[PDB]
From a paper:
We set out to design proteins that can switch between two well-defined and fully structured conformations. The hinge amplifies small local structural and chemical changes to achieve large global changes while the chemical environment for most residues remains similar throughout the conformational change, avoiding the need for global unfolding. Designing one of the resulting conformations to bind to a target effector couples the conformational equilibrium with target binding.
To explore whether peptide-responsive hinges could be turned into protein-responsive hinges, we used inpainting with RoseTTAFold to add two additional helices to a validated effector peptide, resulting in fully structured 3-helix bundles (3hb). For nine of our validated hinges we designed and experimentally characterized these effector proteins using SEC. Hinge-3hb binding was tested qualitatively by SEC and, for hinges which had a corresponding FRET construct, quantitatively with the FRET-labeled variant, and DEER was used in addition to FRET to confirm that 3hb binding caused the same conformational change as effector peptide binding. For two designs, 3hb05 and [name], we obtained crystal structures that agreed well with the design models, indicating that the three-helix bundles are fully structured in isolation. The 3hb approach was able to rescue designs for which the peptide alone or the hinge-peptide complex had shown the tendency to form higher-order oligomers.
Residue numbers in the entry:
A (entry chain A), B (entry chain B): 2 to 97
The structure:
């Protein structure tokens, strides 16, 4: 089970960093004012999907914490939550 | 100055993720014995360097917080500490 939590955590690290990248692209986009509707909607789309992946990873970590209850499942839950939060920020930054 | 903290933050996100990639490689290698002495010493060297980079970004964040106790500078210091900590885990894993 600790190996399942390790794959959950590492997958969360991936979606966090990718949300971090998308958020930066969206923040630079609002400050630049580049109203490339294709680019604005593409970032919005990939940020929305990244969030749904983060929510799925989140609830899967909750399930892996119902069972067991170890620190490795606990850390995998925080990393999923952070990824969810970074994705919601990339979301709201893409709306503008 | 708030743009400087954004750059110090984004740089800390890169160092964090790279420490996450290095650490996973070292744990996977410590678990098995596949790591050659070249590779084991290579992961350690880039992790040690990555650690020093994370200490420099941390201290630069402590300076930025000293100059202005802004929330943007605060989160950048948190991200640098996180990168520092992830780098140190990559160090200890590469020792084995």
């Amino acid at each position: 089970l600790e190996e399942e939590a390790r794959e959950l955590a590492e997958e969360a690290r991936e979606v966090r960093r990718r949300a971090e990248e998308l958020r930066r692209r969206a923040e630079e986009a609002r400050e630049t004012g580049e109203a490339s509707e294709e680019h604005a909607a593409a970032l919005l789309a990939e940020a929305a999907v990244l969030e749904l992946k983060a929510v799925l990873l989140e609830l899967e970590a909750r399930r892996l914490l119902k069972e067991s209850g170890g620190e490795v499942a606990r850390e995998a839950l925080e990393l999923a939550r952070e990824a969810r939060r970074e994705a919601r920020e990339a979301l709201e930054a893409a709306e503008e």
